[PDB]
Structures are given as structure tokens and as C-alpha cells.
Amino acid sequence: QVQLQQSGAEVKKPGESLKISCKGSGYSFTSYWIGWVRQMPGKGLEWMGIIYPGDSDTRYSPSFQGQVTISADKSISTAYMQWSSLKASDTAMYYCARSFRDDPRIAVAGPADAFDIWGQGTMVTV
């Protein structure tokens, strides 16, 4: 039962920090690539940023340099998207993304796709 146990909805205001979760249950969380895609209300999804949680390999999008510090926590399995200064523009239903597995799953298990199974969705309302 591979499940990205994504955190619940958070209701906050701009300025403070947030620690969101995308937890692995019933599988190895390091296997599937954890892609961060943002889906604003009323429209489709949008690739906002990416981090490789295996070694904290972080790549901040150009529009998010300095304002957003995406990280990952592997102990309690909370993949992070920390807004050091929260933005009212980031109020959206955030779906942490798994990777597909159709050919040599044990070999790569990552970067095959951007949707295998998602949890209830961490609705970040800023």
C-alpha cells in the first residue's frame, strides 16, 4: 500500500514558517521521486520547485530564490516546503508527487512520472 501520507490543511498568515509532510507508509520513501507541484485553486497544477531528499539536493526556482526554502525531513518523513516569509499567492492545494514504476522498478523507481498516488492533499492556505 504505497501511500504519500501528505499532511493536513494548514491555515496561517503571511510571514511565519511552515513544516508540511509527505510521509511514506508501506514502502521505501526514498524510492519514489518526491516532486513538488503546486495547484492553485480554480486552475491546474504548476511545477514550483524540486529537491532530492536523498542528500538535500535543492534547486530553487528562479521566482522562488530567497523567499522559499524547500527542504526535506527523513526521520519522521515530512518533505518540507518552508516559506520563510509566507506568501498570500501560495494559497493552494499542494500535492507531493510520486514517480511511476513500469520498467525495472527496482533499478530507478524515480523520475518516471509525476503522479503515482497522492494522499488527501496538504491544503496550504496562507
Binding site: 533499478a107 530507478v108 524515480g110 523520475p111
Partner: peptide, 8 residues
Amino acid sequence: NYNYLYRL
């Protein structure tokens, strides 16, 4: 592009 395999 992690889907090209080889034997060892």
C-alpha cells in the same frame, strides 16, 4: 531519464 538498463 533513468530508464536505460545494463547487466553487471
